[PDB]
């Protein structure tokens, strides 16, 4: 079974009111629904999705005539006018290892419903264009489950004489079933509040374990920031007087925006400086913001169908990005998002699972919570902002809400709202949603006369879903530098400025930048104005100039990225020839300039000193030997490490001074620590023996987790026994903190040491490891699958190990398994020896009886 966007049809039935009663016992939970159903197409059979154990079904208080086959319950004889359906289901939440539906975690109960987990609770029209008003009653043992939560306002509750108690929750906003949530547990609460701009207090409650409560303060501060920001930046106010956040350690996603009752992975909720890195704090601030931003972009306006996922995800990611950039370090953060997209989304678009931002089909919708839908989705939203500017973007947002508040709509609708509010034609912009693959821009420039003439071609490769790719609407932001690197003004079109957005809409166009009175090197795709590959013929000196003198963060960073890539290309050549490594004189000059430049933002400096990953390096290659790319990248890194050894120590010391013993999170102190950790990595590459000095002063240096993490990352590939000793000590020190234990397993899995496979196999049996925990599985096994020299070992050991775990995990958590199996996505592009072994691994996975639809869809994309 495949679902096709072209087959969309409005539902035959609407659900007006959904009344739910939960009776929680050991081990069984019994769910009783009362659905108020309104016929849209009278006389059609009523079709309900559901997979929980079915105990009874009634239409109007009388047992229904029905058939249940697979996960579809059908009632043929339904009234022609409003009627009720009552379903009784029974759940065993402690047996739910999929972490979808109602499930146990740490002795408490939690739900995850998006996209299709609610049908695992009760039989329902489980699709997002069906919106209903939910009221939830919950009965449970008071001592075991003192905390009983669902969406909305708590309107009643009481006690029973037998030790049980109940609550009743009313969510007055119509919602799709994927936004339902329930929590039952023995949990601690942290209370705070926000007062909206119209003067309404909103009580804030974060629920955690009793032990995790001291780590929740930063998330609370982040939420309040997010709430104020949505008001100041978007004019958006919260709509209830209560907002709850519940942390859970067993969770497949990062977090979930269920109305007024968000449920979060602990990793995006808990921090203190002793146990969490600066990046962890940054993540909490983004995701806390993200989920709150969904209250409007996803909840108040939702998705007509799951093909439209990016309507809420692309828009909400853009929102969280803008929130984080407005907080601090806009340019550095933009670069980080760009780097992420290029390192993870670009390979997706170049591979067998590539898809449009709005897919035309899917077998399993869990497989589409993807870098493309989220991050490329955000780049697509950002292009509206680039084309329209802030005021125009905000006009679009206002009309979007005016038109669609209370509706389940499509990407077309958001486009139309942006188009209409600004009096502009964005018909061609629709191809950003329907065409997969990364566009390639072929660029050439000429200064003839006083005119700089930039010619630009575009194509987009076929992808497995679609061969035909038409020209797209691509904004190219540009500037021009003279031979001393300063800004050169130009005319276009009628305006005299130092920067312009060139709107490419045709297969090929020439842009005339007129009135140019000096020799120029152009700066192109400024701010990463469109998510594309751009090829302009730059010389090494052109790149050095851009890197030294350009006013744009992205274009400066891109020039360094290009220099590193050419260096690695030059290493690949000499290593293939069996000759000495290249000298890299110009690159080393450029890097010296960066190390020694004190006008550079610390965190921006750190990015400029980062070398593109192996996947970036083999982008566009065939017959890839991943170990040859690894060796070449490693060589470059070691050359940089050794060449500038005493200068890495010096930068390290300069950063230490400037951090000034300010160990708590702040974006300012974080910038210096980021730089410090880059220097640490280089130092330990050049002088592995420095590990014993580090070990001797470890306590002294371990002033927060950013430092411990940065030290341990720096020494992680070191073949000294001291590296194993430091890891063991870390595990012992933080044995009681599950989120720090995640870091430990990530270090185990990610190590470039020769013995990583056997240490990973030992780690499977560590008392703190749990295969059934998504954070643990990803930390250990996920990191191994990404560990280039080990995953792609020539003997196939890495492929067999990962396939073994995809098989084993898929027996309880298809979502974790389907993500993990994508480590094999490079298959077709590998050299023949490895390719053969990968295809064997995937065939073996395919041969498993009972293989999930999730993993089967991916394997089929890679294999067939
Ligand atoms: Zn989201």
TrEMBL record:
Domain spans labelled Peptidase M1 membrane alanine aminopeptidase: 218-429
Keyword Hydrolase (UniProt): yes
EC number: 3.4.11.2
Residues holding Zn(2+): 290, 294, 313
Catalytic reaction annotation: Release of an N-terminal amino acid, Xaa-|-Yaa- from a peptide, amide or arylamide. Xaa is preferably Ala, but may be most amino acids including Pro (slow action). When a terminal hydrophobic residue is followed by a prolyl residue, the two may be released as an intact Xaa-Pro dipeptide
Family affiliation: Belongs to the peptidase M1 family.
Protein known as: Aminopeptidase N
Annotated Gene3D superfamilies: 2.60.40.1840, 3.30.2010.30, Neutral Protease Domain 2 (1.10.390.10), Peptidase M1, alanyl aminopeptidase, C-terminal domain (1.25.50.10), tricorn interacting facor f3 domain (2.60.40.1730)
Peptidase M1 alanyl aminopeptidase C-terminal domain ranges (all copies): 540-863
Cofactor(s) needed for function: Zn(2+)
Gene Ontology terms describing biological process: proteolysis
UniProtKB keywords: Aminopeptidase, Hydrolase, Metal-binding, Metalloprotease, Protease, Zinc
One Pfam entry name: DUF3458
Domain of life: Bacteria
Function: Aminopeptidase N is involved in the degradation of intracellular peptides generated by protein breakdown during normal growth as well as in response to nutrient starvation.
Tagged with keyword Transmembrane: no
Primary enzyme class: hydrolase
Matching CDD domains: M1_APN
Domain Aminopeptidase N-like N-terminal: 80-179
GO molecular function, one term: metallopeptidase activity
